[model samples]
Target: PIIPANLPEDWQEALLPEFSAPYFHELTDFLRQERKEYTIYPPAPDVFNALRYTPLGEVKVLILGQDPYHGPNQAHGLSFSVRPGVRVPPSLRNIYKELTEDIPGFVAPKHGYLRSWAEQGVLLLNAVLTVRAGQANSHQGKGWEHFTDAVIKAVNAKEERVVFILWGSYARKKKKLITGKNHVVIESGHPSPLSEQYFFGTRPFSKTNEALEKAGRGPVEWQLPATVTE
Candidate 1:
């Protein structure tokens, strides 16, 4: 079977070239071996959920993180997002808080799932897509970083404008990879409570729309409805 045999058809077409690289083969082989000896978050099928929801053609914004949340039942592929019933992690809470203040009529959902945002073309991509259970960034040095860098490079190659939300130093470092002149780079400190002050007022959601408007793309509906709590 192919490394990511179940990836959405659109992604398969866009990332097909990268899959042929030796690094990708090594990454998939390593992940197969890792799964037998340890618990991995997001499972195998959902590792590409971010790409599944935000297709290559629809991509408008990219929210990059370091890795999946290193806790049981926490990460579900989209960066900083958890499953419908999972508790809201600290960083996502700050994201919602900023939304409430930045966008009028935006309701902070009771759950942390960001699928709605993803469907509207927000690529919540993590630099490291998977993690060992209960161990933050356990899979960092693995080839996932190389694969994700390829993702960023792909996004950078697009002709249409894209918005990139880079929070924290680690995420900001990726700015260099976004060499495309048509994209917007919104930077701020990470949203962990320790640095939330920098994140809270940054108004990234609204800024994302502002950039989209300038790009001649329709603004993303940043608000979550009450029904999404389910």
Candidate 2:
């Protein structure tokens, strides 16, 4: 299918048409045109789950990941997130710590299930949405960046009050596109343990809600629960 109907209702009107068409064709052509030359993680269909999870109109917040986790049973399309029951990576762990500090009564969960956040309108997007096994940065220079850039642009065009959270230098590089969009752009170091010092006390979770409130939108329920809603 060129466009999936499972996308958020508002998204079908925003990005599903022309915004996603080129990338879909580009990716499909590349994978099939150069078939089997390189292995693509997340296969083809799941590549856009990030978009599917949080549509353009529903996007109140956007958190960019450098790329998908190139490990078995680790990445389920959304960036910096893994399926439930998978081990929580260090970067996510640091985020959990910050969340706990910002929102009292919040306990860090052992699993990395971020779908709940996405369902609440957080766009957990990756710059490069796919990769090769054990080979980081494998899918760089592909058409994903162009696609995702259009995604951000569409969100900017459609949503007036959005929050863009860019962690680490890689994500920080995208501030230009998000700036001046009448949205709140929050840039901070990544939550990886290696850079945990700067990540801590950033209060991104709380800040996101604060910005949302100031923008006249309701605050997101920022909790990673035991079960994600359907």
Score every model by TM-score: 0.95, 0.89
**What local lDDT score does residue 122 receive in model 1, on the 0 to 100 scale?**
93
Q: Which of the numbered candidates is closest to the native, going by highest lDDT? A: 1
lDDT of 2 by residue, 1-230 (tens): 65654666666666566545666687767767543776667766677788887867678899999888888878888988887777888899888889999987788877898988888899999998788877888768867787778777777775569999999998888888875556998889999988989899999988989999998998888877866432
Best by TM-score: 1
Q: What is the C-alpha RMSD of each candidate to the true structure, in Å?
A: 1.4, 2.4
Model 1: per-residue Cα lDDT over 1-109, one tens digit each: 5547556676777688778888888888888998999999889888988988888889999999999998888888899988888889988888888888899988888
Name the runs in model 1 displaced over 4 angstroms: none
Q: What residue pairs clash in candidate 2, if any at all?
A: none
Q: Candidate 1, clashing residue pairs?
A: none
Q: What's the residue-level lDDT of 191 in candidate 1?
A: 91
lDDT for 85 (candidate 2): 73
Query: What is the Å distance of residue 41 in model 1 from its true position?
Result: 0.7
